[PDB]
PDB file of C-alpha atoms in Angstrom:
ATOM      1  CA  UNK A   4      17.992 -10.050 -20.646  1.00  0.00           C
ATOM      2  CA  UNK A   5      17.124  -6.719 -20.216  1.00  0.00           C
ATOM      3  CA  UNK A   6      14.628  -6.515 -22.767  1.00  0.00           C
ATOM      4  CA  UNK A   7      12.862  -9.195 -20.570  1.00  0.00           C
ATOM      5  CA  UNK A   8      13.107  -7.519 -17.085  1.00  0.00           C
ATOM      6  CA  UNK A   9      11.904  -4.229 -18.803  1.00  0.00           C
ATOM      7  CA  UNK A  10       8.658  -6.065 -19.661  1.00  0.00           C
ATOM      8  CA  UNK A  11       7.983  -6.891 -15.625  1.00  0.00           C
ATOM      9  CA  UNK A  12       5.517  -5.197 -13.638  1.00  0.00           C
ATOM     10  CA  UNK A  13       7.225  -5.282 -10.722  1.00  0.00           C
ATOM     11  CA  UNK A  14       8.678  -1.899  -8.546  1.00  0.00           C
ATOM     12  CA  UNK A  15      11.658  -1.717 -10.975  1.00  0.00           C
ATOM     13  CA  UNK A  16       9.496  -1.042 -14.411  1.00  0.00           C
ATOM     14  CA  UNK A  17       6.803   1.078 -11.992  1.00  0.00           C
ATOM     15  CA  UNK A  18       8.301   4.457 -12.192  1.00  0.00           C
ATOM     16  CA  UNK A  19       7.372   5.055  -8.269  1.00  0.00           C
ATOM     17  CA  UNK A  20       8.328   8.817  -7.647  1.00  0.00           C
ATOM     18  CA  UNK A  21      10.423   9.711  -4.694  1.00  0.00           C
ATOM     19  CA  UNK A  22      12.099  12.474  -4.838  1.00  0.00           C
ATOM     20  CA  UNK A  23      15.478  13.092  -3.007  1.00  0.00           C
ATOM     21  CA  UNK A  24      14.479  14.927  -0.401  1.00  0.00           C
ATOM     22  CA  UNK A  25      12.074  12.003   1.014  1.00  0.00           C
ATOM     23  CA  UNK A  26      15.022   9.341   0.899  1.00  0.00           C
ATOM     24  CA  UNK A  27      16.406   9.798   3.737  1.00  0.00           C
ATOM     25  CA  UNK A  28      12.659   8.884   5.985  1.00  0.00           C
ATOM     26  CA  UNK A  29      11.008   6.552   3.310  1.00  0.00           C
ATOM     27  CA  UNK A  30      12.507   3.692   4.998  1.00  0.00           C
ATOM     28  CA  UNK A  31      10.675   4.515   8.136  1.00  0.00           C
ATOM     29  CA  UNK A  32       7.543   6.220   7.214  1.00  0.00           C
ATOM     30  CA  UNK A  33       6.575   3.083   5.521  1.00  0.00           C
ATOM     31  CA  UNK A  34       7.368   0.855   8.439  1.00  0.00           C
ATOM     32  CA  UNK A  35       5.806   3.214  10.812  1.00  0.00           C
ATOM     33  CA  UNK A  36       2.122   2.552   9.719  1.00  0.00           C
ATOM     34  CA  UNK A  37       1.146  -0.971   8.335  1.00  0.00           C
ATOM     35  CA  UNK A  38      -2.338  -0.095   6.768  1.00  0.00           C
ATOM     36  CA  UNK A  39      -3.322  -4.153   7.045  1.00  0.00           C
ATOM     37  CA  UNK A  40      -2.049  -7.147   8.887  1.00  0.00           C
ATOM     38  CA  UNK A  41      -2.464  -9.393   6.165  1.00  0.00           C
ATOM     39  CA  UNK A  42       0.370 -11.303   4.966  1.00  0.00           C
ATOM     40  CA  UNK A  43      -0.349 -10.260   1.110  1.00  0.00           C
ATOM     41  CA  UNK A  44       0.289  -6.578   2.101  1.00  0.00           C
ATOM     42  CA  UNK A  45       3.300  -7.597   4.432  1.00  0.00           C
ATOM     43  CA  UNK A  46       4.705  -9.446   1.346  1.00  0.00           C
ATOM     44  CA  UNK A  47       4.095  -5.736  -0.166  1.00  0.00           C
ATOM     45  CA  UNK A  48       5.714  -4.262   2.155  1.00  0.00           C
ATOM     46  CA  UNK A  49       8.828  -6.329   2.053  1.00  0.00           C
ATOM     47  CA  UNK A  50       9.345  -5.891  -1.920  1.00  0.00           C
ATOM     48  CA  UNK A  51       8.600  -2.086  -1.427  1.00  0.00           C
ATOM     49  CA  UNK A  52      11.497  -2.044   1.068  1.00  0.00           C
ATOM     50  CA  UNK A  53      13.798  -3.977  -1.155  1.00  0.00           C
ATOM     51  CA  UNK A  54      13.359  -1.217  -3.979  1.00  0.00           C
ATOM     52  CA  UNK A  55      13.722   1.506  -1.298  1.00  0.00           C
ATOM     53  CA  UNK A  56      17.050  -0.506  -0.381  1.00  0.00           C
ATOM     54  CA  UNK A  57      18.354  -0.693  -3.854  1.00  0.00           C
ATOM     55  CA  UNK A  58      18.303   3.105  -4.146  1.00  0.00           C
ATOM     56  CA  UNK A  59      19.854   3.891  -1.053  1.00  0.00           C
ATOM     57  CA  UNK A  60      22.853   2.198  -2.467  1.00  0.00           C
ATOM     58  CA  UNK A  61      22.114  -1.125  -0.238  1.00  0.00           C
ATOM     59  CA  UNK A  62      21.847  -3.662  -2.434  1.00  0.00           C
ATOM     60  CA  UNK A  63      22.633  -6.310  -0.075  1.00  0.00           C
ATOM     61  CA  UNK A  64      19.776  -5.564   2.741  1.00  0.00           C
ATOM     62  CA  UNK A  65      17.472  -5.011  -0.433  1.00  0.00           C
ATOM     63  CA  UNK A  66      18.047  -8.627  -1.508  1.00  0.00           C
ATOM     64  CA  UNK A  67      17.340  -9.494   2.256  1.00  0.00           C
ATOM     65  CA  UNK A  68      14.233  -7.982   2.108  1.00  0.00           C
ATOM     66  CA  UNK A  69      13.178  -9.903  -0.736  1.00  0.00           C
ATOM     67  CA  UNK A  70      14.253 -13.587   0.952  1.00  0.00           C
ATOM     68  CA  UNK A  71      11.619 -11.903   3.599  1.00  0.00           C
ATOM     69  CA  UNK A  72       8.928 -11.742   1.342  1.00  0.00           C
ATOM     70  CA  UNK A  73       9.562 -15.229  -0.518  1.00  0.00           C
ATOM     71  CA  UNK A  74      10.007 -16.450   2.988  1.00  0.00           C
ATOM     72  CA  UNK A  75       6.191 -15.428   4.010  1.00  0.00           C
ATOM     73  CA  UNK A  76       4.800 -16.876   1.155  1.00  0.00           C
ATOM     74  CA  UNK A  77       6.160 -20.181   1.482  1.00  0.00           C
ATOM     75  CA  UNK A  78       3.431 -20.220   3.968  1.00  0.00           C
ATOM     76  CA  UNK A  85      -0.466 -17.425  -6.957  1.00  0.00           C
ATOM     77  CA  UNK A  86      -0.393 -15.021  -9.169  1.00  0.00           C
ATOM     78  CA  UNK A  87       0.863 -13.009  -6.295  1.00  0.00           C
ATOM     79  CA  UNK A  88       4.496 -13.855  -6.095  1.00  0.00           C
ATOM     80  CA  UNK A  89       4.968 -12.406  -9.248  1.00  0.00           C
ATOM     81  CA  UNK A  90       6.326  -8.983  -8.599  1.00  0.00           C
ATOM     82  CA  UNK A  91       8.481 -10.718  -5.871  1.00  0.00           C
ATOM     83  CA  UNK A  92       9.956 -12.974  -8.651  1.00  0.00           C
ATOM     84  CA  UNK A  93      10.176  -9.478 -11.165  1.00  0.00           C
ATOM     85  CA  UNK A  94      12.106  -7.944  -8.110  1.00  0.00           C
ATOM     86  CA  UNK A  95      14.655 -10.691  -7.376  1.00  0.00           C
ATOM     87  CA  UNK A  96      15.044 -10.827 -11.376  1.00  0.00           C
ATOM     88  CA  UNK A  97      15.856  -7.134 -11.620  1.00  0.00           C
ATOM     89  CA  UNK A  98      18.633  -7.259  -7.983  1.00  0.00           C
ATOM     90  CA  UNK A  99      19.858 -10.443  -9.418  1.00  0.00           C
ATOM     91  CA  UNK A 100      20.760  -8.533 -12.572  1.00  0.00           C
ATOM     92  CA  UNK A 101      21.884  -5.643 -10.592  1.00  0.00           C
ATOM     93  CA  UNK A 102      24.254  -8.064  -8.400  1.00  0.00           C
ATOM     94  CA  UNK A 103      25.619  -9.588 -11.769  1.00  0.00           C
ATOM     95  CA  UNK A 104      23.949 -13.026 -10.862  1.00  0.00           C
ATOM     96  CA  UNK A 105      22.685 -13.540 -13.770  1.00  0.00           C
ATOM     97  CA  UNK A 106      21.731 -17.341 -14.004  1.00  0.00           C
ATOM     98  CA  UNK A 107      19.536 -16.215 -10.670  1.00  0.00           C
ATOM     99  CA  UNK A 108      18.082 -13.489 -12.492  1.00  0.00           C
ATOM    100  CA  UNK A 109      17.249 -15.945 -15.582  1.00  0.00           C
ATOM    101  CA  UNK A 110      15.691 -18.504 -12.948  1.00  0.00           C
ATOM    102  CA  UNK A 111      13.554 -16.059 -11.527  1.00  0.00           C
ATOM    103  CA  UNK A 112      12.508 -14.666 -14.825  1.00  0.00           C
ATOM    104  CA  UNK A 113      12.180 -18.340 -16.392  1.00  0.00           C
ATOM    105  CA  UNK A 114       9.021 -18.342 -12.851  1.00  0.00           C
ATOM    106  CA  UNK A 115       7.539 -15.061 -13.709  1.00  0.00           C
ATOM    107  CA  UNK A 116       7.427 -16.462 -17.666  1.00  0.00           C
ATOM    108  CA  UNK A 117       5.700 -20.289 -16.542  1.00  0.00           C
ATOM    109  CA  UNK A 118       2.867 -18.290 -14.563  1.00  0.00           C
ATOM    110  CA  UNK A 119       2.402 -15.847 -17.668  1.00  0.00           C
ATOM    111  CA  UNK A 120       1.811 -19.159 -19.673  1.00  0.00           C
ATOM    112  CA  UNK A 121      -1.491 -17.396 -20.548  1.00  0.00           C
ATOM    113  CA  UNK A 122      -4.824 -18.357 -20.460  1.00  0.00           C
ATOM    114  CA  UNK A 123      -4.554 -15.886 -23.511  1.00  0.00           C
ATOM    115  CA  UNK A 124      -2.269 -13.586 -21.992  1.00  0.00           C
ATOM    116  CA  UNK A 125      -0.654 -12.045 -24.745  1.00  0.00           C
ATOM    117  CA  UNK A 126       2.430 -11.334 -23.126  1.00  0.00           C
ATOM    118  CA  UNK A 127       5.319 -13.318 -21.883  1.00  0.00           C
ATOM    119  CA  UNK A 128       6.931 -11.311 -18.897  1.00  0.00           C
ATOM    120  CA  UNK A 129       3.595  -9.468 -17.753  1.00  0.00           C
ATOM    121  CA  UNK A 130      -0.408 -10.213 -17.101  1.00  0.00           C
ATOM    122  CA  UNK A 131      -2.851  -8.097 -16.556  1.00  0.00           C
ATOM    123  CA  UNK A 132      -4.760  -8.869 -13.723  1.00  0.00           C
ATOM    124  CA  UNK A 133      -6.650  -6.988 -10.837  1.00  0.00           C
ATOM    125  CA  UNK A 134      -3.981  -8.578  -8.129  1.00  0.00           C
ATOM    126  CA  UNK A 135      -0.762  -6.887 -10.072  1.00  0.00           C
ATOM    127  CA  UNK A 136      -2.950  -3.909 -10.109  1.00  0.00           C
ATOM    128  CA  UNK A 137      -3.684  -3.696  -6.645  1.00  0.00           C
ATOM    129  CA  UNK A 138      -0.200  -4.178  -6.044  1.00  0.00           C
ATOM    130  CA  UNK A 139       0.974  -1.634  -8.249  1.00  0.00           C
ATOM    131  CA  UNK A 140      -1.676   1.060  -6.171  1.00  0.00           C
ATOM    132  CA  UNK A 141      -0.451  -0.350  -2.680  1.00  0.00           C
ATOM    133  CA  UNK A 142       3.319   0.765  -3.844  1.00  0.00           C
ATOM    134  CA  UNK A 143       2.565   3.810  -5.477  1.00  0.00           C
ATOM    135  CA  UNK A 144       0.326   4.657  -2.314  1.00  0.00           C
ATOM    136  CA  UNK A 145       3.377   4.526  -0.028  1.00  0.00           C
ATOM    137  CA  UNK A 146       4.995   6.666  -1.830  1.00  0.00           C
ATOM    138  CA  UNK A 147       3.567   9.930  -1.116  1.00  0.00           C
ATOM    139  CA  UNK A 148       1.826  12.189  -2.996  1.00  0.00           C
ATOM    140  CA  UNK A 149       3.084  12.839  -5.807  1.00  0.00           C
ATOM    141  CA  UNK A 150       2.217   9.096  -6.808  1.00  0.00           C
ATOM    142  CA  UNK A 151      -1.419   9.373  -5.151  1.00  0.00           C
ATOM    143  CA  UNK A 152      -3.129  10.015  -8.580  1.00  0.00           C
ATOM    144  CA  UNK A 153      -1.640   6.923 -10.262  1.00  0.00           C
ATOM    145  CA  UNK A 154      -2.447   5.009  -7.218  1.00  0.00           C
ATOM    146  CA  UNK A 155      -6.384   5.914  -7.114  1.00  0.00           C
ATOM    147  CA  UNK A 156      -6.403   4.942 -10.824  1.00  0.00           C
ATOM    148  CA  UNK A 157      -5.267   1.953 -10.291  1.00  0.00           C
ATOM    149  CA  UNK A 158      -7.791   0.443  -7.574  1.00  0.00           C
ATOM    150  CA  UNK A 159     -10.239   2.411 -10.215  1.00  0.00           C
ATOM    151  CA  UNK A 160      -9.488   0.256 -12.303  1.00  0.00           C
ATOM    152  CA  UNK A 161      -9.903  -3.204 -10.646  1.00  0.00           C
ATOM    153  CA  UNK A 162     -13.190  -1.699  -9.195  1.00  0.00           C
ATOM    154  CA  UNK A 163     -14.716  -0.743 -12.324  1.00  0.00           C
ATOM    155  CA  UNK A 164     -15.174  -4.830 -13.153  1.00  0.00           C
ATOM    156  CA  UNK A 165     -15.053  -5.374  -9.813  1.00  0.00           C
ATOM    157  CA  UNK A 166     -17.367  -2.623  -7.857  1.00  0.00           C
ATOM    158  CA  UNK A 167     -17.425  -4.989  -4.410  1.00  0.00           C
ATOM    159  CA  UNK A 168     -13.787  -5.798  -4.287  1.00  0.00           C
ATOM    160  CA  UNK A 169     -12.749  -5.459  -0.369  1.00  0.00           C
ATOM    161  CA  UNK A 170      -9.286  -5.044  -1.038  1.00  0.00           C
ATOM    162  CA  UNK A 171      -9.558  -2.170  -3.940  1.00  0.00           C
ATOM    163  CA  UNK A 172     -12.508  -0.376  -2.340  1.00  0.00           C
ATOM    164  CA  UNK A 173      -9.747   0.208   0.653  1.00  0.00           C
ATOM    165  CA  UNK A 174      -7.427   1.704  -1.676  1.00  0.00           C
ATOM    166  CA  UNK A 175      -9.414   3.650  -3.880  1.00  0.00           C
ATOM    167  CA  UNK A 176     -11.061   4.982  -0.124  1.00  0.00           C
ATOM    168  CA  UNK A 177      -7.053   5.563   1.139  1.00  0.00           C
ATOM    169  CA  UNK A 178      -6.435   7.495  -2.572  1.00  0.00           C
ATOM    170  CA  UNK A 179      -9.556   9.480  -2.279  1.00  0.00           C
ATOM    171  CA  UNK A 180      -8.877  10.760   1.592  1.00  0.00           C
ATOM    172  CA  UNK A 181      -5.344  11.346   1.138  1.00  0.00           C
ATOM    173  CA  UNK A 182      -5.497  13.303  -1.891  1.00  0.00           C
ATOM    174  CA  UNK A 183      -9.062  15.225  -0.758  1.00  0.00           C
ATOM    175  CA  UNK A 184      -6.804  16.570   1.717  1.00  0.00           C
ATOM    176  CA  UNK A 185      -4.798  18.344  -0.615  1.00  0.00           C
ATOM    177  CA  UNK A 186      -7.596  20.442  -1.819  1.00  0.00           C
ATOM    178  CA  UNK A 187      -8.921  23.561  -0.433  1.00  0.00           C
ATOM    179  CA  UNK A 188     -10.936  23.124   2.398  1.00  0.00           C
ATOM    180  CA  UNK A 189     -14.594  23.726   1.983  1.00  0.00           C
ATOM    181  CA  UNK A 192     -19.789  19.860   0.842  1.00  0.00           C
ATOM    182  CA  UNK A 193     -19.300  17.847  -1.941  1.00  0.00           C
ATOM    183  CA  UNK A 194     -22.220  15.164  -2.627  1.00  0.00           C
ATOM    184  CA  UNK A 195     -21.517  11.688  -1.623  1.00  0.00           C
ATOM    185  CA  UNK A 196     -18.074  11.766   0.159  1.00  0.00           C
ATOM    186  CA  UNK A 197     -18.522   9.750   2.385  1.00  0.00           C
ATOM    187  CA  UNK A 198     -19.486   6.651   0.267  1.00  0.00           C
ATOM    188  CA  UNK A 199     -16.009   4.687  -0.463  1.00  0.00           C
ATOM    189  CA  UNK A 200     -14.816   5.024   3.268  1.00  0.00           C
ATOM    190  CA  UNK A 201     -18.594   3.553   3.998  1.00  0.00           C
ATOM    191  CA  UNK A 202     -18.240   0.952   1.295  1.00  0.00           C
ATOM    192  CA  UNK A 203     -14.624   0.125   2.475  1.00  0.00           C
ATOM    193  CA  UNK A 204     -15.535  -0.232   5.924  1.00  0.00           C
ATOM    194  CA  UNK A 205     -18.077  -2.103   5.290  1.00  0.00           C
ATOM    195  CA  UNK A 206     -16.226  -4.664   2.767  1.00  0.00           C
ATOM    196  CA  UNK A 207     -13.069  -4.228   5.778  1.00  0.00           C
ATOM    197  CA  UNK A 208     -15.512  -4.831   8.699  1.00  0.00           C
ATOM    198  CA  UNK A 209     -11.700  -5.960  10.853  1.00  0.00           C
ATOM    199  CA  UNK A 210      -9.620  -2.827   9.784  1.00  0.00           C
ATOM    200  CA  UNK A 211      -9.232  -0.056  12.460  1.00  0.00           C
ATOM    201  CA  UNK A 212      -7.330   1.928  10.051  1.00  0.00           C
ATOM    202  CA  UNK A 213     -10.175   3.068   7.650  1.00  0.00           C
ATOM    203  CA  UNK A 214     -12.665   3.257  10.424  1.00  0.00           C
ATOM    204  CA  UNK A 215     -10.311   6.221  11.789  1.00  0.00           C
ATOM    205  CA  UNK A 216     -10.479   7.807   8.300  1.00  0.00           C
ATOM    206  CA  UNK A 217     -13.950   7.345   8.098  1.00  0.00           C
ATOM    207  CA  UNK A 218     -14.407   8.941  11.659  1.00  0.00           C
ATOM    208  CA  UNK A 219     -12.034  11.923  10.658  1.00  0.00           C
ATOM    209  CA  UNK A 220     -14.402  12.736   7.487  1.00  0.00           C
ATOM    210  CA  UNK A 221     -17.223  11.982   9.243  1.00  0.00           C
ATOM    211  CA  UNK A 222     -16.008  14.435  12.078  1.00  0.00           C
ATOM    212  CA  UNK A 223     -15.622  17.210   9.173  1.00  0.00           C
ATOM    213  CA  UNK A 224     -18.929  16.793   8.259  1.00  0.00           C
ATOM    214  CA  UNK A 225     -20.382  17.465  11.766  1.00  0.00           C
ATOM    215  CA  UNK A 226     -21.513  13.903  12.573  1.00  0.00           C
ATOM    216  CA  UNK A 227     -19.017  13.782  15.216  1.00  0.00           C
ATOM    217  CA  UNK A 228     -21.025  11.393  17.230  1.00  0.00           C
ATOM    218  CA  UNK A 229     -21.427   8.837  14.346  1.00  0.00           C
ATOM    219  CA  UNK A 230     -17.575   9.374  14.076  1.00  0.00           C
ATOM    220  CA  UNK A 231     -16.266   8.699  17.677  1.00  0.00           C
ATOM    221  CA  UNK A 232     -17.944   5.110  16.897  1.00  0.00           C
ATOM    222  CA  UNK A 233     -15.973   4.288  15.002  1.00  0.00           C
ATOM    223  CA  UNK A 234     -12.697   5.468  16.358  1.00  0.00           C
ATOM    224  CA  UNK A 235     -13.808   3.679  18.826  1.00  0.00           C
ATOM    225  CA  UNK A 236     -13.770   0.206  17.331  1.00  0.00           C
ATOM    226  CA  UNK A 237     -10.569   0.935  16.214  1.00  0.00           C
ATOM    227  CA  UNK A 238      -9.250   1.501  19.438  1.00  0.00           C
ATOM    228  CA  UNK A 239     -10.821  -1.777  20.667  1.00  0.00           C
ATOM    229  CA  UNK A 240      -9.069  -3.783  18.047  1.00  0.00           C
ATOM    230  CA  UNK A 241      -5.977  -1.691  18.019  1.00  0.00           C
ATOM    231  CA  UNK A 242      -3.872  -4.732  18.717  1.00  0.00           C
ATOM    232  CA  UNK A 243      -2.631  -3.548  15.346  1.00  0.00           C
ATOM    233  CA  UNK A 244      -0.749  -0.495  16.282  1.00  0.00           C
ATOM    234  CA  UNK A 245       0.529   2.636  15.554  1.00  0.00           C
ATOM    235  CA  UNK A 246      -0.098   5.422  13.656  1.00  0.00           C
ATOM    236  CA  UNK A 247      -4.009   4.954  14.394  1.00  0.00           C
ATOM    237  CA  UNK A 248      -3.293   6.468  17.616  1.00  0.00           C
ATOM    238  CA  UNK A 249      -2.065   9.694  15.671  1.00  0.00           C
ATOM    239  CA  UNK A 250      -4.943   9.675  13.516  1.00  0.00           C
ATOM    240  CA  UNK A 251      -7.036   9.302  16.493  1.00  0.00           C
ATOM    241  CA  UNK A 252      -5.586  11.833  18.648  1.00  0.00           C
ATOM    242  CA  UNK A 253      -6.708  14.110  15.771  1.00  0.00           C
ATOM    243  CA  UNK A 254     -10.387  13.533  16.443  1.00  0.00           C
ATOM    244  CA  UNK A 255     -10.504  13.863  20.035  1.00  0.00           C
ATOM    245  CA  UNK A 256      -8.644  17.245  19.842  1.00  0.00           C
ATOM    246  CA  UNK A 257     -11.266  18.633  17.612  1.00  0.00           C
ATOM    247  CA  UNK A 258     -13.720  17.006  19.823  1.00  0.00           C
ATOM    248  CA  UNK A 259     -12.305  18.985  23.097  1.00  0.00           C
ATOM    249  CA  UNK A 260     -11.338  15.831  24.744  1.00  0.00           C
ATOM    250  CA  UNK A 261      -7.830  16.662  25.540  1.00  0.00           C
ATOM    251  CA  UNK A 262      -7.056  14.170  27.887  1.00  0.00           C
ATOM    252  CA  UNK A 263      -7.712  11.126  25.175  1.00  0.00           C
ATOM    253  CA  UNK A 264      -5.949  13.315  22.524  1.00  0.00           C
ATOM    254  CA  UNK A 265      -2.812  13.755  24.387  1.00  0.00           C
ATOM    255  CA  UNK A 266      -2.807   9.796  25.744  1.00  0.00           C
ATOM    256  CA  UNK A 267      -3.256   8.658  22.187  1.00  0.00           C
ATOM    257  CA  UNK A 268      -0.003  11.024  21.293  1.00  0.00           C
ATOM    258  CA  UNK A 269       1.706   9.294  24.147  1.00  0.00           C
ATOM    259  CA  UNK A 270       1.050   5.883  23.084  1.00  0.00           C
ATOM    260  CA  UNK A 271       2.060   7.075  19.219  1.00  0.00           C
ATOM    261  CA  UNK A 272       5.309   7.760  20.468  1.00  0.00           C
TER     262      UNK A 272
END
């Protein structure tokens, strides 16, 4: 049995690092800023909870959180990890004819083409899933992540959903580095916005970097779309409260902070 759930890819066999001293927020800090509205990434979301859950000693509203994301899917080789998750708090619960059902689901959509493995596939999806968990984890996992979406873009150089990652990986860990330009750094926001023509989120990013690079004008375009399709809130506002206080507009910056709050 456990030889089995070891071979998952799933958040349990993932190696996600958290260390103890973000506990205590994770919970939040990944609720507090949905990326995308799509219900792939909410599913995401949901299983990246459960784990959360699990280690917090709450392995009842992790197992909750995982009815949530079978629930949303009821509406692929997608429900995979979810399946891998329930296996793993099934096993954890000591349920484990559950576990075995949910492992004997994961197994059937493994029935290769010639996948070579039983419990596991390779395939760009599970990889994009594995770089959406590791990037809300923080940044000690940010490497990993921007591998990952590497990865799916190297066979797959147009892929909307992995340009947006590799884009996410790139900004957030460019930010660690010493300030001050590099050739070309704009491209994968440009290519992600482009291939995520509806997401507000990026086009903030974009406008930050593009604000760096003093094309501020170019850059309150776009945080200006944003804020017109901001229906999808929150943490845009922060992001775009940013710009406008490096702009001088002080006014927008601290109404934006307002509505963050």
């Amino acid at each position: 049995v456990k030889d089995s759930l070891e071979q998952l890819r799933c958040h349990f066999t993932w190696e996600l690092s958290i260390d103890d001293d973000e506990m205590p927020d994770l919970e939040n800090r990944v609720l507090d800023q949905i990326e995308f509205l799509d219900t792939k990434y909410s599913v995401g979301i949901h299983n990246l909870l459960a784990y959360v859950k699990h280690l917090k000693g709450q392995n009842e509203e992790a197992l909750k959180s995982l009815k949530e994301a079978e629930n949303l899917m009821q509406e692929n080789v997608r429900s995979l990890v979810t399946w891998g998750n329930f296996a793993w708090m099934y096993y954890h619960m000591g349920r484990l004819a559950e576990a075995q059902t949910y492992l004997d689901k994961v197994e059937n959509i493994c029935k290769k083409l010639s996948n070579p493995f039983r419990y596991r596939m390779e395939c760009p999806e599970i990889d994009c899933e594995e770089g959406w968990a590791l990037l809300k984890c923080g940044g000690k996992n940010y490497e990993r992540a921007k591998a990952c979406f590497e990865k799916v873009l190297e066979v797959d150089p147009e892929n909307p959903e992995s340009s947006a990652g590799y884009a996410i990986s790139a900004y957030r860990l460019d930010g660690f580095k010493l300030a001050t330009h590099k050739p070309f750094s704009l491209l994968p926001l440009r290519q992600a916005v482009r291939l995520n023509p509806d997401n507000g989120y990026i086009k903030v990013l974009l406008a930050l970097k593009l604000q760096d690079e003093g094309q501020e004008a170019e850059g309150e375009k776009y945080i200006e779309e944003a804020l017109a399709n901001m229906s999808s809130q929150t943490y845009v506002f922060r992001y775009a409260a940013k710009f406008y206080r490096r702009k001088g507009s002080v006014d927008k910056a601290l109404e934006l902070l307002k509505k963050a709050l």
